[PDB]
């Protein structure tokens, strides 16, 4: 069944599961042609496949060449996503394969279902949550690897850095979704908060800065304030 606020802690039990977000797979800039018509130009994209318990992120980079000479690209993007997720599952040892894949957009259900027919015991689930995984390209080292890629490439990251040494998965996922929600709602301000202080650095082997526990509390409060303000503006409340 669908994943929602009510069964939220299922994400952090010991059944292997993956979120799959396809929102950055097919990315375009829109521009005018010499004749004054509109055209798109694709840029590199990515599938965001995330184990919310461990933080492991399988970032499959989608090179613009995959679209060459293809029609109905937004529909193709969903099947390409499902093809690559299915290939990822096949590549994993049996004991690492997920028991559930949760797609962030319901239009991925049928493509993934069809690509996963060989895994009848892997449940493909939609979600009612409005997760901010589109903002993954606001994380500088993920954006940098996607844009620099010259060919299809699968790269492994831990999106929680070392946080799990000190906090639980539930708390780690809440921090991640807060940071991403903030980056989605007002990227410039969120990034200002994260990097204002030059003395706090990002480890060469990490995605986020090396905050102490106390600094994280301050950071998290600043992201909350950001998100609430932006909202009052959105709705004039």
């Amino acid at each position: 069944g669908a994943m929602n606020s009510s069964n939220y802690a299922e994400l952090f039990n010991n059944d292997i599961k993956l979120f799959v977000d396809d929102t950055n797979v097919y990315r375009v800039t829109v521009h005018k042609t010499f004749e004054g018509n509109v055209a798109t130009k694709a840029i590199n994209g990515c599938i965001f496949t995330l184990n919310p318990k461990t933080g492991h992120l399988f970032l499959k980079i989608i090179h613009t060449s995959v679209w060459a000479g293809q029609k109905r690209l937004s529909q193709l993007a969903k099947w390409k996503t499902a093809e690559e997720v299915s290939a990822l599952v096949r590549s994993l040892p049996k004991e690492e394969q997920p028991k559930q894949i949760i797609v962030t957009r319901k239009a991925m259900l049928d493509p993934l279902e069809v690509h996963m027919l060989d895994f009848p015991n892997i449940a493909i689930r939609p979600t009612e949550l409005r997760l901010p995984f589109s903002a993954a390209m606001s994380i500088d080292k993920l954006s940098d690897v996607v844009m620099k890629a010259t060919e299809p490439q699968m790269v492994l990251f831990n999106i929680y850095d070392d946080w799990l040494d000190r906090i639980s998965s539930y708390t780690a996922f809440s921090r991640l979704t807060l940071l991403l929600r903030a980056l989605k709602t007002n990227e410039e301000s969120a990034k200002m908060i994260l990097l204002s202080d030059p003395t706090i650095t990002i480890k060469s082997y990490h995605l986020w800065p090396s905050f102490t526990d106390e600094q994280w509390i301050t950071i998290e409060s600043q992201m909350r304030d950001l998100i609430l303000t932006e909202y009052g503006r959105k709705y004039n409340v």
Binding site: L76, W79, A82, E83, P111, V114, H115, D118
Partner: protein, 300 residues
């Protein structure tokens, strides 16, 4: 012209014969149905006046034997039986006709409705969907489930329709996931037509038989089967031209004959809107589209 005599009519019942129906009162001197056109299958069906649930009935073909109906007070229903003594049967039928105790199959000469609804339906195929090999006729009722329904519980009493499942290995070639799911032509033409049904006539016969079971008995699984077989054709980009033309005629008469009051439960909105307006074959079912629009514009 053939006859299905009735031993008696002990309980009040509405009797249908093909698309016709008559009311018979408790212990009314009714003794059967004559002038049944040879050359087609037929269905004789029943709904008791006391129990408007479980419509039931029998598919038969008078070229395959002499059949009659007899009420069974233990099992509480009108049962079809075969009379193997041909002299004894002719004698009974001649006496009942002489005494004019039989209704006449009420075919108008101009009317091809029943032919058009049963064009591809064969008794030999019905008896493979309804397995009861000791009888030459086949019982169907409102409640019988299909094999596909069972997979998702008595096998002897199931409808063994061909299983169609758009998200199945059978339907989807490895490496053609997107192609085969969006264009079902290879599942239609190779898997189903060439492989399982062998020809389009057998496919159309099962489709027509499923529709008739849905209409006459309100058999829900039959209704599912009918719509699935429609959707498989409409969702294929490559369909022989003769099949599309014939499908348009098949569906036209099915929609024409459907009771107006039953369109809500017997017609699936999604399948019809997709077949007539979104699918590859949206422009290939002109007669069917025209009667649907003029008779059920609400559904669409």
């Amino acid at each position: 012209m053939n006859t299905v005599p009735f031993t008696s009519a002990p309980i009040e019942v509405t009797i249908g014969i093909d698309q016709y129906s008559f009311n018979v009162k408790e212990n009314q001197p009714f003794h059967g149905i004559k002038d049944i056109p040879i050359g087609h299958v037929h269905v004789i069906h029943f709904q008791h006046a006391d129990n408007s649930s479980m419509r039931y009935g029998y598919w038969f073909d008078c070229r395959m034997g002499n059949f009659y109906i007899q009420y069974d007070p233990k099992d509480g229903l009108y049962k079809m039986m075969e009379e193997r003594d041909g002299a004894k049967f002719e004698n009974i039928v001649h006496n009942f006709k002489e005494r004019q105790m039989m209704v006449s199959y009420p075919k108008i000469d101009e009317d091809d409705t029943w032919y058009n609804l049963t064009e591809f339906v064969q008794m030999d195929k019905i008896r493979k969907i309804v397995r009861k090999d000791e009888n030459q006729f086949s019982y169907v009722d409102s409640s019988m489930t299909t094999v596909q329904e069972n997979e998702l519980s008595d096998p002897a009493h199931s409808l063994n329709y061909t299983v169609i499942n758009f998200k199945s290995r059978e339907a989807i070639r490895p490496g053609h996931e997107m192609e085969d799911f969006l264009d079902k032509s290879y599942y239609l033409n190779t898997v189903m037509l060439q492989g399982i049904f062998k020809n389009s006539s057998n496919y159309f016969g099962e489709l027509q038989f499923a529709f008739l079971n849905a209409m006459f008995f309100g058999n829900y699984g039959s209704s599912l089967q009918w719509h699935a077989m429609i959707e498989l054709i409409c969702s294929s980009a490559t369909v022989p031209k003769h099949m599309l033309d014939k499908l348009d005629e098949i569906l036209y008469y099915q929609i024409k004959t459907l009771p107006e009051q039953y369109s809500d439960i017997l017609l699936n909105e999604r399948v019809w809107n997709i077949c007539l307006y979104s699918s590859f074959q949206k422009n290939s079912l002109h007669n069917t589209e025209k009667i649907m629009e003029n008779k059920y514009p609400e559904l669409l």
